[PDB]
Amino acid sequence: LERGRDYEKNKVCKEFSHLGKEDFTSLSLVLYSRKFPSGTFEQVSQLVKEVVSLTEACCAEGADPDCYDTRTSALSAKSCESNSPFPVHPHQPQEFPTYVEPTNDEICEAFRKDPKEYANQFMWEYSTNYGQAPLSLLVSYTKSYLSMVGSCCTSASPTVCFLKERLQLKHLSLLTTLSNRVCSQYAAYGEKKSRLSNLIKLAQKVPTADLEDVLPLAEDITNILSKCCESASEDCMAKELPEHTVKLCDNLSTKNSKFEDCCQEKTAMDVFVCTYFMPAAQLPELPDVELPTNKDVCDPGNTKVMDKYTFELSRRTHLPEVFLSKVLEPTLKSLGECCDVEDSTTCFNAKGPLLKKELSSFIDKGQELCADYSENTFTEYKKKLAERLKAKLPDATPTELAKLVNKRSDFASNCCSINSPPLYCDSEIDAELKNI
Amino acid sequence: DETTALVCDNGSGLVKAGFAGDDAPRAVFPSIVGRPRDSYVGDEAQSKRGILTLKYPIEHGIITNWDDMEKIWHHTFYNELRVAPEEHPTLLTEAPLNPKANREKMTQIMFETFNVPAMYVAIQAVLSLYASGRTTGIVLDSGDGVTHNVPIYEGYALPHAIMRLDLAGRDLTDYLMKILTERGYSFVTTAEREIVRDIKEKLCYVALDFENEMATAASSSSLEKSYELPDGQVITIGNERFRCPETLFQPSFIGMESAGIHETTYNSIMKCDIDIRKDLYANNVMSGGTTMYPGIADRMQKEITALAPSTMKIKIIAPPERKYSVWIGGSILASLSTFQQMWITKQEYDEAGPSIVHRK
Ligand SMILES: Nc1ncnc2c1ncn2[C@@H]1O[C@H](COP(=O)(O)OP(=O)(O)OP(=O)(O)O)[C@@H](O)[C@H]1O
Ligand SMILES: [Ca+2]
């Protein structure tokens, strides 16, 4: 494969020649920006100019072979110097993008003034914010976006040009931001939890479906993420993702009205954004689901057993996936310990009942934290919260009470939804759970 | 090089219709049908008010009387546009959350009674966004009979985030009548109704700071204007210029206990994923005639800024032609070469009956 020993050098040199200096630079800016999400536009540009410096010089026929490995190790050298011109590092997923595309007038204003400056700022700020998407997509989207801005900002009819271009960009734009989002989720959880999460969400979106209806979908999307997210293939995600919605609709098209509507959208990405944003449904009211039996827990090839538990529980529990995901994972791993240590029916008698209440408690507290959030508008949610809080802390002052409404409201706006951010809410659900 | 698609924006108070490619609607008339108090539609129904019984087939953005609706469409095709529907693909508009059966019925009527070669039904609010050369943002659409907030992502309007407010132009007109009458004037008849409607569109505005503006008026003038009635008698409008539009923000001025437009805009965004809210706050477009008040952009900007995280870029898109943004966005969209593959043909219809309109 990459056994090259010079693979890197011959890889970049090949790229340098095929793309030309300008495009190689643009490729590097995007590449290094997704690598250093917290990197400044000044730090990243320095690293890029350095990288393109040694690449042009050391890829030239005549250049001594000696170099590339030289200025490359020399390049990493400057990385240790204090206040180094390059991006700092202790690559984590960005759960809160701050990129905000300016108005068509602001875009064109900035583009007339200085095109290059504009293009680099756009590639850096965009890449650093949605760097979790495949490199080939970022480079592709980025280039297609600038092309649009270049022709619409000089058009006789800027507005109609933009609508037209934006509609044609739609596919790639979604493919890019969606893949960045779901890949960030996959990176935060890891293949194991990611699959659990996708099953939970699917369960909450189609409560009335069969396990065999959604389990396949949860496995597929996980497979795609595992394979495509950090893949070199220029078409892993581009090809896999839309193929996934076809299966998704083939299975769920007729299971409920929301999925039917979503499956009526025109294109594959139109359907994916629809199902991705779909909220947790009105779950059925059902008898608690008991924790898996000792035989189920220890038996070989018991995945199906654990999956059915997760599904059966998730479709009847009114709690956000971020909550359910952080509890089911440990609960099961704990119950799992009993199978190892000698004497099964014994440890499962001590740890078993302990885990039940611990899980039951955790859910009731979660359902308390997410009070009336799903049932109402934010505005109305805050009113109710203020009321139930005035009834629980009568001796509290209007200010303390006001401070509490905000903190809990803020927390809920972030962690009481089906697509609430994994990393952020995990440490946040803990700091908020101990407040009971 | 010919054919010419038709764009018909069916409103609760005014229907806007013209041709795709035009910068503005060719015709604009009231959504009313006059029955023998033998039938009239639009401006004429208005005139022969006395000897007619007025019906509004589109009360709150949603079509509720199909016989009258056909009356309106026939009228816009033959009298207003003076065209032959049989040879014009027609783009129709519908309210957010318009029931499936209703949409299918619009399709039925289009192909079966007017035999249009093709057609399409588009969500009014989405067209407003398109009219701005954008596909992502939150729209505040406010007409004569209904107000909506629609969050849209890459063309997709998030249904569960749609906010509907039963307060629009018609209500402001009615309120400005009450407070004008209270100030010692008489506005109650239907003709007086249209007079007040005119005062509202020419001299009303939204105050950046209600109270401050309210005291400034109660203290002196500068906030007083003169309006000439048909009598030739001229009156002066004071603080009612901003007290009227102020109800958009305070639905209680008319005893309605519901959130104001700044709050429905706020809530709509909050029903969306954290990572796209920024794109909603920075692309907040206003469309509809009741969105025409001067100062309303700065006011909304202010209100949302007090509701949102101090670090959010808040931007209001309020074009001067926003009274027709829906129609205009319909015109641009229907004129796209990429859109031509979106039409519903008479063939696809014959081979599938209604319901073929489901592809959004
Ligand atoms: N310049 C203006 N200032 C204030 N209000 C205006 C202005 N021009 C029109 N309007 C008002 O806005 C409302 C109308 O129009 P739109 O054209 O938005 O209505 P629709 O589409 O007919 O109704 P809806 O959207 O509620 O179903 C009317 O009730 C009218 O009084
Ligand atoms: Ca309208």
DSSP B42-81: THHHHHT-TTEEEE-TTTTSS---HHHHHHHHHHIIIIIS
Task: Say how far residue A135 (Cα) sits from the centre of its chain.
Answer: 15
- Within 13 Å and on the Cβ side, how many CA atoms surround A295? 0
Please report which ligand is nearest the Cα atom of B203. 1
CB atoms within 10 A of CB A183: 23
CB atoms within 10 A of CB A43: 18
Kindly write down the DSSP assignment for every residue of B101-163, as one continuous string.
Answer: HHHHHHHHHHHHHH--SEEEEEEHHHHHHHTTT-SSEEEEEE-SS-EEEEEEETTEE-GGG-E
Can you point out the beta strands (E) in B238-297?
Answer: 284-287
Q: Which of B319, B58, B51, B218 is nearest to A105 (CA)?
A: B319
Q: Whose Cα sits closest to atom 27 in ligand 1?
A: B12
**Ligand 1 touching residue B57 (CB < 6 A):** no
CB-based contact B287:B128 (threshold 8 Å): yes
- CA–centroid distance, A142 to ligand 2, in Å, is 36
Domains and CATH numbers, chain B: 4-32+58-121+324-358 (3.30.420.40), 33-55 (2.30.36.70), 123-168+258-319 (3.30.420.40), 169-254 (3.90.640.10)
Per the structure block, which two tokens stand in for A73? 């190790």
DSSP state of B16: E
Report how far residue B176's alpha carbon sits from residue B244's, in angstroms, rounded to the nearest whole number. 6
A266 contacts B359? CB cut-off 8 A: yes
Kindly write down the DSSP assignment for every residue of A230-288, as one continuous string.
Answer: T---TTHHHHHHHHHHHHHHHHHTTTSHHHHHHTTSSSHHHHHHHHHHPPP--PPP-PP
Per the structure block, which two tokens stand in for B261? 């437009």
- CA–centroid distance, B7 to ligand 2, in Å, is 13
Report how far residue B285's alpha carbon sits from residue A403's, in angstroms, rounded to the nearest whole number. 32
CA-based torsion, A108, A113, A115, A121: positive or negative: negative
Residue boundaries of the structural domains of chain A: 7-91, 103-190, 191-278, 294-370, 377-436
**Ligand 1 touching residue B174 (CB < 6 A):** no
Report how far residue B63's alpha carbon sits from residue B98's, in angstroms, rounded to the nearest whole number. 9
Q: After which residues is chain B broken (C to N over 2.5 A)?
A: 37
CB-based contact B104:B357 (threshold 8 Å): yes
Q: Which of A162, A260, A168 is nearest to B137 (CA)?
A: A162
Number of H helices, E strands in chain B: 13, 17
Report how far residue B148's alpha carbon sits from residue B163's, in angstroms, rounded to the nearest whole number. 6
Relative to beta strand B33-36, strand B40-41 is antiparallel
CB atoms within 10 A of CB B298: 14
Report how far residue B45's alpha carbon sits from residue B31's, in angstroms, rounded to the nearest whole number. 10
Report how far residue B103's alpha carbon sits from residue B93's, in angstroms, rounded to the nearest whole number. 10
Question: Min CA distance, A419 vs chain B (Å)?
Answer: 7
Residue linked to tokens 């009568």:
A394
CA-based torsion, B151, B157, B159, B160: positive or negative: negative
Same fold, A103-190 and A191-278: yes
Relative to beta strand B40-41, strand B52-55 is unpaired
CB-based contact A305:A292 (threshold 8 Å): yes
Ramachandran assignment for B207, one of left (phi > 0), alpha (psi -120 to 50 degrees), beta (any other) = beta
Cβ-proximal residues to B8 (8 Å cutoff; 6+ apart), any chain: B15, B16, B17, B73, B76, B90, B91, B92, B93
Q: Which of A412, A403, A420 is nearest to A377 (CA)?
A: A412
Residue linked to tokens 């101090």:
B310
Residue linked to tokens 């089906």:
A418
H or E element: which one contains B237? strand B234-237
CB-based contact B96:B72 (threshold 8 Å): no
Cβ-proximal residues to B328 (8 Å cutoff; 6+ apart), any chain: B23, B24, B127, B131, B321
Nearest to A277 among B163, B273, B335 (CB): B273
H or E element: which one contains A194? helix A158-205
Q: At what angle do helices A7-19 and A41-58 cross, to 10 degrees?
A: 100
Q: What angle do CA A303, A307, A313 make, to 5 degrees?
A: 150
H or E element: which one contains A32? helix A21-35
Question: Min CA distance, A394 vs chain B (Å)?
Answer: 27
For domain A377-436, give the CATH number: 1.10.246.10
Class of domain A7-91: mainly alpha
Q: Which technique?
A: X-ray
Domain A191-278 CATH assignment equals 3.40.50.2300: no
SS3 A63: strand
Report how far residue B136's alpha carbon sits from residue B139's, in angstroms, rounded to the nearest whole number. 9
Cβ-based burial of A212 (10 A; exposed 0-12, middle 13-18, buried ≥19):
exposed
Backbone φ and ψ of A229, nearest 5°: -45, -60
Report how far residue B256's alpha carbon sits from residue B171's, in angstroms, rounded to the nearest whole number. 11
Hey, what amino acid is at B273?
D
- CA–centroid distance, B288 to ligand 1, in Å, is 6
CB-based contact A27:A76 (threshold 8 Å): no
Cβ-proximal residues to B130 (8 Å cutoff; 6+ apart), any chain: A163, B329, B332, B333
Cβ-proximal residues to B190 (8 Å cutoff; 6+ apart), any chain: B49
Q: Thinking of the domain A294-370, which architecture would CATH place it in?
A: Orthogonal Bundle (1.10)
Topology at the third CATH level for domain A103-190:
Serum Albumin; Chain A, Domain 1 (1.10.246)
Relative to beta strand B118-123, strand B137-142 is unpaired
CB < 8 Å to B130, chain A? 163
The DSSP bridge partners found for residue B316 are B284
Q: Which of B311, B289, B315 is nearest to B301 (CA)?
A: B315
B313 contacts A104? CB cut-off 8 A: no
Report how far residue B198's alpha carbon sits from residue B184's, in angstroms, rounded to the nearest whole number. 19
Nearest to B154 among A103, A170, A413 (CB): A170
Report how far residue B185's alpha carbon sits from residue B192's, in angstroms, rounded to the nearest whole number. 11
Hey, what amino acid is at A403?
K
SS3 A344: helix
Atom of ligand 1 at shortest range from CA of B146: 26
Per the structure block, which two tokens stand in for B320? 């001067």
Residue linked to tokens 């070199």:
A232
CB-based contact B333:B109 (threshold 8 Å): no
Relative to beta strand B6-9, strand B90-94 is parallel
Relative to beta strand B156-157, strand B147-153 is antiparallel
Nearest to A264 among B155, B283, B359 (CB): B359
CB-based contact A208:A255 (threshold 8 Å): yes
H or E element: which one contains A11? helix A7-19
Question: Min CA distance, A95 vs chain B (Å)?
Answer: 7
Report how far residue B326's alpha carbon sits from residue B123's, in angstroms, rounded to the nearest whole number. 9
A281/B contact by beta carbon, under 8 A? no
Hey, what amino acid is at A330?
P
Strand ordering across the sheet containing B40-41: B40-41, B33-36, B52-55
Report how far residue B306's alpha carbon sits from residue A351's, in angstroms, rounded to the nearest whole number. 50
The DSSP bridge partners found for residue B53 are B35
